[PDB]
Amino acid sequence: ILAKNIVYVAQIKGQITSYTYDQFDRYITIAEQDNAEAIIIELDTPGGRADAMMNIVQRIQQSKIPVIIYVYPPGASAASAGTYIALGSHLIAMAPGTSIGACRTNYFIAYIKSLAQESGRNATIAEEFITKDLSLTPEEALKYGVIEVVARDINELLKKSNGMKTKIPVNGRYVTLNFTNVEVRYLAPSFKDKLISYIT
């Protein structure tokens, strides 16, 4: 026979809107319901410094399982509200060839700085995202302590995150990721998701 821990993977491409929050909620909900070891959101977001964001961030922070924001596929970028979402998550991995930061108020600074500090990721850089239109390369990003992992695909990501400690608690406890006997389940975007899209 056979059996193991589950990891869910879901994409979230395009601009972040009020409709986005519902997606995060769906995916993270499904994952929570099955006690997934974690969930990876492959995230490629490009522009319009939104606000549905901190509602998403609250979502993540209150999630009952780790949420890994993976800025993938190559060419993807996480900007404006992307980068908040990420800085507020439990782990940030990045595929080579992607970016993070701003694409090419003091309130917002206060905010990015906050997100960074509570997850021990570099807040001086965080600020510079907003105050210098900074854009990091996964390697620079990792050097500077903004992200935790650089991975070419889901599988590297799993191997490299294995055993790493969550950067912010998961329901009060810091968790050590154990992707040792894991099964990955791919979740696809719904039909409304699908349409509410092209129509944008």
Place this chain on the structure above:
Amino acid sequence: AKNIVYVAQIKGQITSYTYDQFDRYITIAEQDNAEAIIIELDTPGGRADAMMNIVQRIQQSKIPVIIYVYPPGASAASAGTYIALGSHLIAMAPGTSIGACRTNYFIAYIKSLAQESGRNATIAEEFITKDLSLTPEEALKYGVIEVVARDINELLKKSNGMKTKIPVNGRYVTLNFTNVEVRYLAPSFKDKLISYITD
């Protein structure tokens, strides 16, 4: 509670040891009645031969074996391309190659592998007789492979519903990656070493 798809890598030159690996992976897959197994294949080649034995292994496999020439920059070469032409499904990631790297028997053989899987055999020959190399897109266009996919997930999405190119235990199968779980299989320790030594 779903269907399992296994994923395994096989990088580097193909030797008599390699067979052992396919056998292991394919065996694990068979034993759990996987919906299928994907071998991410990167094979630089330069004339080897363990191949003929591996291909029989695949043909006799009790579940579909999808040869996926991956990661970007990978090459399915010489030995590789026979293994692939002899499999159930061939996908390729963008930025990879198939064919020769850079007789009146090996030709008969590539031709054969091609015909029995309905993949273009005029090109197959041209691999060996014109040291030809194809790009996933050209490969697709020419009818050598079945799928071009950026990552395991596209691969599953694009292959879903496709019919196997050669039978699986006598029956052609239609892939159904509809409620699937993916399990990644890592190279063992011997494998890991026999690499450093087979260097």
